[PDB]
Amino acid sequence: EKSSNTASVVVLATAPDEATAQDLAAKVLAEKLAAAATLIPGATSLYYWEGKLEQEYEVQMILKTTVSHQQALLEALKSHHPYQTPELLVLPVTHGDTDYLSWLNASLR
Amino acid sequence: TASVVVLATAPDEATAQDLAAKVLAEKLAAAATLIPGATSLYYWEGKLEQEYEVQMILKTTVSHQQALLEALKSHHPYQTPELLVLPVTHGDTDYLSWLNASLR
Amino acid sequence: MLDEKSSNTASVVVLATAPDEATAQDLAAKVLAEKLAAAATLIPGATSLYYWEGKLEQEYEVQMILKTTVSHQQALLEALKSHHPYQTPELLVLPVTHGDTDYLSWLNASLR
């Protein structure tokens, strides 16, 4: 167990297009389920579906939140996302700048 | 099986797509996101090097991370490619199940 | 290649964002020269959304992914913050659980 100084986490999610990504971000940010969202459009996603190699353009999303809100955030993202089962993963943040983390935590209240 | 995210790079989109297709076919990863147009910076013997790279983000499980890393390394055009594993501490239950159901 | 049971590491990745490519390259160059980071990947074309003073902001920035170790994470963050043109820049540290020992070993050798 690595030593951690914060309950903050990073959420990785993918959206089908830029318009969807911006709306999903605006939504969860507005409901204070995330403090910030970074969108990287024009990415290429590869995966198998029914035995066929799929290749589609997607938007990589990186959202910042905390453990206390990770479940609510995923539920919200999933519900508004057009896909039934979109990529929704949470990575742990072990450390960060104190001022940024303070703002991140306050943004969720 | 706990899930993980693997960060790796490829010189160009063609190579990134080829490596991704290979590991996905061998069921060593469930999905691969490629972000071309990235710039890599690092020092080498006192000289600042700058290179163009395609950032890869592969999704798999701890039980497959070793096989995935070895496969990416063996087919990689680079001698010392970036290959890092990041832990996934939580995720949507259904997506996590899909990830596992896609691996060997 | 060594597996997670036969090798270990204290490597971490740092996520930070910069306003533009010129600033990102300068920030990266600085911390790399100081051996506070071993490598840095810059991804341009990143859109950042967040509320600031009660208003939704939308900035077009560069996503930086820096590689370092727990031993240098604190110094790296202070260095990035000091040179960053932002007041409260995004600076987060994620733990690395495993990786290619050749790459991990190279990173370590490139640090203070």
Distance CA C20, CA A27 (A): 26
Asked if residue A94 lies in contact with residue A19, where contact means CB atoms within 8 angstroms, the answer is no
- Name, in order, each residue with C-beta under 8 angstroms of C22's C-beta and a sequence gap of 6 or more: none
Whether residue C40 contacts residue C32, with contact meaning beta carbons closer than 8 Å, is answered with yes
Q: Residue with structure tokens 């691996």?
A: B103
A88: closest CA of chain C, how far (Å): 17
**Does C50 touch chain A if contact means CB atoms closer than 8 Å?**
yes
Taking an 8 Å cut-off on Cβ atoms, the answer to whether C43 and B37 are in contact is yes
Contacts of residue A89, Cβ cutoff 8 Å, sequence gap at least 6:
A11, A12, A13, B3, B5, B59, B88, B90, B91, B92, B95
Question: Largest alpha-carbon pair distance within chain B?
Answer: 48
CA distance B104 to chain A (A): 13
Which residues, in sequence order, are bridge partners of residue B25? Answer: none
Find residues 56-85 of chain B whose CB sits inside 8 Å of chain A. 57, 59
Task: Locate the chain B residue with the closest alpha carbon to C12.
Answer: B86
Of B13, B16, B92, the CB nearest to A78: B92
Buried-state track B13-45, b at ≥16 Cβ within 10 A, e below 16 = eebbbebbeebbeeebbbbbbbbbebbbbbbee
Q: Which domain holds residue C105?
A: 1-112
* Closest chain A residue to B28, measured at CA: A47
A53 touching B, CB under 8 A?
A: yes
CA distance linking residue A61 with residue A87, whole number of Å: 10
Q: Between vectors from CA B70 to CA B81 and to CA A15, what angle results, nearest 5°?
A: 70
Of A29, A40, A93, the CB nearest to C94: A93
Nearest to B98 among A44, A46, A85 (CB): A85
> Are the beta carbons of A2 and C95 separated by less than 8 Å?
yes
**How many domains does chain A contain in total?**
1
Resolution (A): 1.7
Nearest CA to CA, how far is B68 from chain A (Å)? 15
List subunits contacting chain C, requiring 3 or more Cβ pairs under 8 Å: A, B
Query: Helical H runs in B1-104?
Result: 13-25, 62-75, 93-101
Nearest-CB residue to B55 (from C41, C96, C97):
C41
The answer to whether C21 contacts B9, with C-beta atoms less than 8 Å apart, is no
Three-class secondary structure of residue B38 per DSSP: strand
| Alpha-carbon span B56 to B53, nearest angstrom | 9
Q: Give me the residue from C48, C49, C77 closest to A97, CB to CB.
A: C77
Indicate which of A77, A87, A94 best probes the interface with B, i.e. most B CBs within 10 Å of its own CB.
A87
The amino acid present at A45, given as its one-letter code, is S
CA A96, A102, A103, A106: dihedral to nearest 10 degrees?
140
Q: Does the CB of A95 have a partner CB in chain C at under 8 Å? A: yes
Kindly report the CATH number assigned to the domain that includes residue A9: 3.30.70.120
> CA B69 to CA B10: how far, in whole Å?
14
Instruction: Return phi, psi of residue A46, to 5°.
Output: -125, 140
Helix (H) or strand (E) holding A104: helix A98-107
- In order of B34, C21, C27, C86, the CA distances from C24 in angstroms are 21, 5, 5, 12
Q: Is C31 near chain B, with CB under 8 Å? A: no
Q: How far is CA C102 from CA B79, C7, C109, in A?
A: 9, 11, 11
